[PDB]
Every structure is written in C-alpha cells, then in structure tokens.
Design an enzyme around this catalytic site. Structure first.
Site, PDB file in Angstrom:
ATOM      1  N   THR D  46       0.863  -1.173   0.000  1.00 11.04           N
ATOM      2  CA  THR D  46       0.000   0.000   0.000  1.00 11.04           C
ATOM      3  C   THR D  46       0.909   1.236   0.000  1.00 11.04           C
ATOM      4  O   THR D  46       0.433   2.375  -0.054  1.00 11.04           O
ATOM      5  CB  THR D  46      -0.943  -0.004   1.225  1.00 11.04           C
ATOM      6  OG1 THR D  46      -1.668  -1.243   1.259  1.00 11.04           O
ATOM      7  CG2 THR D  46      -1.946   1.161   1.142  1.00 11.04           C
ATOM      8  N   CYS D  47       2.222   0.968   0.048  1.00 12.00           N
ATOM      9  CA  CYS D  47       3.305   1.957   0.025  1.00 12.00           C
ATOM     10  C   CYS D  47       3.299   2.866   1.243  1.00 12.00           C
ATOM     11  O   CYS D  47       4.269   3.589   1.526  1.00 12.00           O
ATOM     12  CB  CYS D  47       3.237   2.779  -1.269  1.00 12.00           C
ATOM     13  SG  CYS D  47       3.549   1.797  -2.783  1.00 12.00           S
ATOM     14  N   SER D  48       2.191   2.810   1.968  1.00 12.71           N
ATOM     15  CA  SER D  48       2.016   3.596   3.166  1.00 12.71           C
ATOM     16  C   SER D  48       0.978   2.829   3.946  1.00 12.71           C
ATOM     17  O   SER D  48      -0.223   2.959   3.701  1.00 12.71           O
ATOM     18  CB  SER D  48       1.512   5.004   2.825  1.00 12.71           C
ATOM     19  OG  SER D  48       1.553   5.854   3.955  1.00 12.71           O
TER      20      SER D  48
END
EC number: 1.11.1.27
Lengths: 237, 239, 237, 239
Positions: D46-48
């Site tokens: 979700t990259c974050s």
C-alpha cells in the site's frame, strides 16, 4: 492451435517476500516436462472450487509420472497471486503472475471479461509442455458462464497416464465425533483412497442425507455413483 | 401438570453480541404462540443427532401453522448455550439459557442427574404455549431406549396440524451462476417444496456430485432418497 | 482455610471419546505435586483470557520444578469441558469436570452466581497440592465483577520457585509481513522470551501505536512498562 | 483536468454477499458529497501502511463535515477487492472494483504499470466530488520517495476543513464489565474525543497492559504517546 508450438518468451516479475525475482519462461519450461492450467483470476469460486485443489492433490502422482512442475497461471500480479497462494493451501504448485496478460496473450488465450469487471483475463485451459513445446492442450469450450469440463486435473492425468486407472469419486456424510464415521474415514486412508467429506455441520443437515441416501443417520458413504451405506456396509464391499 | 397454567416468570441472563441482554419470560411468551422443548444439557450426546435438528427443520412448517417461536431450553448458561448454538447451527430456533434451573424448576421439570455429573438439569419434554399458558405438554416417559419418544418435533407437528403431511426429503447440488440450477430451484419454489442446497462453492465440490449421483454436472436433484437428475429431469417428475 | 487439609474425596465422571472413565481424587493427587486452579465456568472471557493460556504456557516450567500435573477445575460436565478443552489449545493441563460442584463444595469454594445464570459455580482460586494435602491457596478477593489478581500462573510460579526470576512482560505491535517485525519476533524467540503480539490487523490500528508509542510505524515493542522502539532499538538494548 | 466536470458514467460489477450487485456511478455520486482516492492496486505494498488506514481513521471527521461517503478505487475486481477489504478491515470506506479500468480511464488517470506486472492501473490521486461534479483533485507528482505527498487523507481534510485540528491519538486498554473502563470511556465521549479500544477479551490480554503501561490493571489510557493511567487519572487530565 499452439500444440506443437513453442511457448511464448515471457519474463515474469514476481515477488518472494520483500524482493523482486524475475522468473523467465525458459527457466520454467526448458528441458522440463510441465503441466500448466490457466484461470480467469485469483480469489474465485470455480477456480478455488476444485480446479486448483485437485491439481495440488494429484501433483505427487504427476511427479511420479515425469512431470517436473505444475503451474497455475492467472492474469494477476504477484502481490495478489501470493496473497491468494497463501489463502489456498497448495504447496505442490507454482503460481505464475501473468499480470500483463503477456504469456496468456502469446498462448492466444487472452479474453475479455469486462462483464465481471476483470478486464482482460485468461480463458480456462490446461496443457502439457515438453521442453517449451506445447504437446497437448485442453481448451475449455466456448460456452457462457464459467465452463469447467476439460481443464481439470483428472482429464490431464488420464491423458498423461491413461494406464493409471481412474479412482472412483468418494463423498462421505459424517457427524462430528460420530464413532463409526472415523471407522470409514481412516479405513479409506488405510485403503489409500481420496474422498470428499460433507460434514453434517456447516455443509449439510440431516435432510440431504435422508433425501440422498434415505437412511436416517450417518456415516453415509457414496463411491462413484453407487450408494454404499453405513460404516458396516463399506467394510463388506 | 402445568397444562392450563401460566409459564414461570423468569428473566434470563443472555449474551447478545459481546454484551449482556436480559430476555424475560413475558417477552418470549406474551401474546405469542410458542413451541418449547427442554434438553438435559448442551453438548451432551443430544441422544438424537436429529432431535434438535428436526425442530429446526420443521420450524418453517410450524410458522406456517401459527407458531411464532420455537425455543430450546437447557439448564446451561449463555456462554455454553451460544457456543453450542454455533455448533448445531440451527438458525430457526432460539436458545434459552436457563442456567439457574429457575424456569425448569418452575415447570416442575427439574431433575437431578448427578450420575452423569450434570448436577440438576431439565427432564426431556416439549410443550405448546399460547400467551403464557401451557396448552399441551409432552413429558418423556421413564423408559430405556430412544430418549425422545414423545417430545420430538414430529409428535408436536402431528398434534398441532394433524392435517399436514410432511413433504419427502429434497436435496439439490448447485453452483453459482448455473441457470439450470435456478430453473430446477424455481420449479421447487412453485411447488411448496423445501430443499437443502449443497453449493459447489463451499458446501462441497464436483467429487461429491459424481459420487452421489454418478453424473458429471449440476444441478443434481434428490427427492426422498431417489435420484431425479437436473433442471430437465425435475420437470418430467413434476408433470 | 483448607491449607494443610486433605483435598475432598471425589470421583469425577469423565468422558474420553465415547467412553466413560471415573477419575478419582486420589488418582489425581496421591503421591503427587499438583497445581490446581478453579474457574467460574467453561467458555468464558477472563477464564480463557489468560488464566488458562498462561497456565498451559508455564506448564513446562512447573514440571521442571517438580509439579506433576496442572489441573483446571470448573463446575461443568465433561461434554462441555471437552468441547471447551478442544476450543482452547492447551495440551499441558488436565480438565476436571466438577459438574456436581462436589469437589468445589468440599473446597469451601462453591458460590452462587445466579446473577449470570450460572447457578452454583466455583470461585476463582489456585492452589498447590502435595500428596492430597493443600499446601498453599490463592483465593481471589471477594470483590464484585470478576476478580483476577491472585490465582494467575505467575503468582503461583513466584510462590513455587521464587528463585526463578520474573521475566518481563513483552507486547509487540506488528504489521503483517512487515520485514523488520520478524526481525524482533524471532529475535525474541532466539532470546527465548515470551510475548504478546498485538497485530495491526484485527487487534489494533495505527492510532494506538501512535497514541501509545508516538512513533508513526511498526514494529513497536514495549518490554515490561518501558518503551523499546523499532526493531533496531530492540537490538541495542 | 476533470475539475468541474462530471464523473464518468460507470456500472461496477461487485460481489455483495454471495451474489452479484451492480453499483452504478450515479448511485454513488448523485446528490452526495463524496471523497475518493485511487490506488495503483490491492495488496501491493500500500506503500504507506497508513494511506488507506488514515482515510478510514478520519472518516468520522469527514462525515462531521458533510462528506457522505469515502471511496477507495482500484483497478481490481470485487473478488480481489473484497479479499483485500477483509484484510485492511477499514469499515469506514467503500471499496470500488474498477476492474475494467473504465472509471479510472474516464478520469484520465489510467496509466500503464507493466514494469511491475500490473498491466494498466490507476495513478495515485484523491478528489472531492459534489453531486457528480469533480470539485477538487489532488494528483500525485512524479517524484521519488513518499508515494503519497498530496493524495493523503490529511491534505484532503486540511482542504475541506482547514479550521479543524485533529485530536491527539487516544488508546485505552479495557475489559468486559469493568465499570472503571466505562467511566474512563464516558469521560472521552463527553469530550469529543475518539479512541481506539484494545479489549482484553480479544484484542489482547494482561501481558500487553503490563508491558505498555507498567500497570497491573485496566483501564489504562494513552493520549498522544503519553501514558495517562485509569478512570481516576483521566479525570485529573481533563480538569
């Protein structure tokens, strides 16, 4: 038809933990006998129904007959493929993330499925590949819905090793604990036979048993069409 | 007997969701026609892996005949009752945790079962309750053998609606999408027939359909122990 | 107090599969060092919360210190006790179905709990029994609700083997997969330390972490009160 | 840009329950104020591990300010979207399976990501939609580093309600019954404060409360990284 033709040259961008690993088409197929079966997509009913389990179950047998690897191909990415591979419990097959539909396209198997919101995906089919050359191909018929009557693992097995005799289908109605049920279960294991256990728990109630078998109790066992009976009838035959 | 008498005034301490909820006797019985059947205990050999099931199975029919609720009463607490209800999976009946034996006692049905290590528990019996007043009661006899010769759901049904004739058992193997399955199922709908459904998505797979019907596709329909076939086949049978 | 007194003479009617088996009080306690802890009932929150797990977890240690058996006693029958024993995954302790409340009564521990619909049940307490003679007893205080601050496994351990130093409490916030999380988990295992892993999955979100630790990510580790930090802080200390 | 323009007319094939349900674009946006944020894909880093979470976290606040729905859009199908929604467990947001890339395409946000094996997917962006008309749009820049420097929920909130000042993070360890926990929790209620709750019944146990607070009982309250204590303690803080 791709039969007799060389499998497409594709490099798959896969994920193994936190690292990227390129799996090439050659790496998978060269100098190897491989069974492959494509699915419309990861996380779905008829694909996780039996198409997938059934292949993982017969993998040891295919290996015994020369098959090196058995691959599942789907136009999905690794993140989704892995997350699915983790949900399914199939340690005998490799998951190939044909996320760009490249391999599927090369196999002339890329179809549109916008009516489900899947965009372009693979059409269901299985195949046997010898050293990169498609030997046999079982393409599911062009019928509406979700056809599954040719890409199954059995059809494949009967093709690869027709000598191997087809084992009868075995389903068993059982009640949790139920003394004599275990007397049919392990008796099967001991007999070295695979089976589907419909548990009166969440699968079915007592109606079905009474509607299917007629008898008023479990354990009920049916082996390939014919109706067996109680744990004590199983024994006899 | 308690026949003709008012059911005991009891407040049951139950567990709904992750919170406590008092279910009162009045709430359950007032202005309602209820069927009730007590059991010695939860998880004990239900003694008839059909007793509790059969009530859940005929519940739709009892509703068809005026019964509002069908309750299972056992001298157990909600934690145990719930954990059991989650086992038995009988969506058609309410589980009443008469854990203090209060309701059971009031019904003069409290008996000691120390020989099994159950302490005081309820004796097997069923009853029909109209607006709090016990109308009929089926108290199990002290005979060895089948533990449910009178409190069963059938005996109750034949009493409530002797006119009724239960339909034969109907089971059909189906799959998602499969319009044939739908055609077969509608046919049953348009026939006042009930039918268990073994979905190929979860309840089972192809193996079972091959094994049981010796056929390779769904829908496969079984009625009363006899194999009927698929959408097509049913229609022939219903002609 | 029952301390210094002989445990009640009771025969428990238990179930092992489909057969009845009488387990006598003497059989359990005679010529043996036993730890016992009673619960109000099977299938409940604070009883399955930690009271039970914690005992199953420290069982190997109690054995190392001379304890033969560790029993869980509840005024429930075997059917319910077994069904619960099966739900809980505790292979280190024996379940005693004091369904008639007889043993509990003999221990002067039988209390009424009609306000929950439990009828008469046992009051929470643990004890150490040497050859049938109650040596030590940890009776939970008479406070409302569900008191648990004396019958725990730790209090018992500190009593049985005060030499054994109290291991610090360890909780860890982790995100599934999360590279460096596994770097703290197995590091703990390697360090041979027990811990409670609060997963950002269904246990908590990111708020708590940020509210408790302040840091904006996982893995977060707290060891006995003091705040550790990232997988890289764990290492240091 | 699409700002000031009508959102694309799309019918999403979704899976509600064990059945198919068409969710139309109009159904989602007509006569409603909606927040939307697209992602390259489900299950991808979700990259974050905060991006999707932070939206679900501030959803109550957005609702407080007029936003009806907050949607997550990804060029994935429902099966995958659902299986992911069941992972992320973000009850406050709707998951939209733009599996054909149709909606994303219409928003001129469809981009190729063959270098990851994702085929065509959506580019990172968020937007505010009033009655079908794109009002504001936060299109992520092509810069390395943090993948969400503009489409985050905060940037959106500050835009929608710059007046607002998010409360500090609040977490409290609790148990069932524990009136002290309730007293502490009511106090928060009567303070316009939100609070995550780690229940000792499931979310965790005693070990965690000892480890984190160095205290032996609940309720234990943490506000903004600082430890506050229990029912008693909170009251001192809120004086």
């Amino acid at each position: 038809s791709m039969e007799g033709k060389k499998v497409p040259q594709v490099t798959f961008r896969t994920r193994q933990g936190d690292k990227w690993v390129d799996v090439t088409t050659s790496e998978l197929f060269d100098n190897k006998t491989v069974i492959v079966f494509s699915l419309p997509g990861a996380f779905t009913p008829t694909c996780s129904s039996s198409h997938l389990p059934r292949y993982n179950e017969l993998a040891p047998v295919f290996k015994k007959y020369g098959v090196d690897d058995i691959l599942v191909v789907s136009v999905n990415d690794t993140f989704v493929m892995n997350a699915w591979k983790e949900d399914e419990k199939s340690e005998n097959i490799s998951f190939i993330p044909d996320g760009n539909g490249e391999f599927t396209e090369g196999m002339g198997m890329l179809v549109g499925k916008e009516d489900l919101g899947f965009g372009k995906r693979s059409w269901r089919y299985s195949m046997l590949v010898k050293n990169g050359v498609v030997e046999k191909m079982f393409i599911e018929p062009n019928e509406p819905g979700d056809p599954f009557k040719v890409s199954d693992a059995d059809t494949m097995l009967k093709y690869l090793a027709p000598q191997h005799q087809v084992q009868e289908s075995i389903s068993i109605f059982t009640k949790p604990g139920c003394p004599f049920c275990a007397k049919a279960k392990q008796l099967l294991h001991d007999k070295g036979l695979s089976f589907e256990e419909i548990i009166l728990g969440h699968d079915a109630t007592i109606v079905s048993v009474r509607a299917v078998s007629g008898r008023t109790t479990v354990p009920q066992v049916f082996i390939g069409g014919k109706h067996i009976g109680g744990s004590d009838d199983l024994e006899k035959y």
